[PDB]
């Protein structure tokens, strides 16, 4: 009922301005804040504490501090974070890169 509430309460902020936004977006935010256990804030207090990588939560309001306690207890980064990669200068698992591409030498012969 909380999620319901939350959403309801968010939609009303946009509705008061004749502004319109399709369910899905607000619903995603609502959901994002609500999954884990209940109400998790979109602030340095909540969302940026979760198990997300280090280099990610690292690009937002607590930089050095975060990296310090990162090597201290030897974290490990998947490198699945869009950010992660950007920091690294590599293509991210983002749309155009949500897959790989390959040359099937076989069929590469029927074409001749």
């Amino acid at each position: 009922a909380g999620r319901a509430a939350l959403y309801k309460e968010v939609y009303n902020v946009i509705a008061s301005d004749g502004s319109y936004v399709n369910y899905r977006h607000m619903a995603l935010l609502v959901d994002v804040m609500t999954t884990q256990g209940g109400l998790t804030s979109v602030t340095r207090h909540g969302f940026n504490r979760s198990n997300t990588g280090a280099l990610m939560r690292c690009s937002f309001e607590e930089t050095v501090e975060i990296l310090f306690e990162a090597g201290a207890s030897a974290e490990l980064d998947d490198c699945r974070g869009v950010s992660e990669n950007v920091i690294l200068g590599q293509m991210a698992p983002i749309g155009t890169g949500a897959f790989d591409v390959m040359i099937d030498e076989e069929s590469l012969v029927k074409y001749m």
Partner: protein, 171 residues
């Protein structure tokens, strides 16, 4: 000693060669970059067995240029020596320090002091040699050594080998 190990290489192909007979160009590439190579991890990769069924699997295209990288899984014949191994070969050189023998693609050298007492080195001999009351080691003479130690190096492997022990010497 000699071996048959299952290995695998990775070659990066530039679009150009993306033809009808690519499979063919890869193989050859595989060959020029493996046949004759050396490492301490594998020894001498001498020859690629079974040339026909070489696996190329599907190749994946890198992501900034068009090249493709294939993981060619092949099989071959290798040779990597060992300390404590006993192999026999042909002498090749000789001097006031000992004589160098050749065990296959490799070469094992023998120190003057790492051989028998009663065997002296002869200077003015020609070609150079070592003499014993009964033995005559020189150029061709086939010996049989014990590799006391192996040393890796650039594109090859070498070793010091004694013949002071028993059942060793020439035959």
């Amino acid at each position: 000693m000699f071996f048959i190990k299952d290995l695998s290489l990775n070659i990066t192909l530039h679009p150009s060669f993306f033809g009808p007979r690519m499979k063919q160009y890869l193989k050859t590439k595989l060959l020029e970059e493996v046949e004759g190579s050396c490492t301490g991890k594998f020894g001498y990769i001498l020859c690629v067995l079974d040339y026909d069924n070489i696996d190329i699997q599907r190749g994946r295209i890198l992501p900034t240029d068009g090249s493709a990288e294939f993981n060619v899984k092949y099989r071959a014949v290798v040779f990597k020596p060992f300390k404590g191994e006993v192999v026999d070969g042909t002498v090749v050189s000789c001097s006031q320090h000992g004589f160098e023998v050749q065990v296959g693609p490799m070469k094992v050298f023998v120190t003057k002091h790492l051989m028998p007492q009663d065997l002296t080195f002869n200077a003015g001999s020609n070609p150079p040699s070592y003499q014993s009351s009964e033995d005559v080691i020189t150029i061709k003479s086939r010996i049989r050594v014990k590799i006391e130690g192996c040393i890796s190096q650039v594109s090859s492997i070498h070793a010091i080998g004694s013949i002071k022990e028993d059942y060793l010497g020439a035959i």
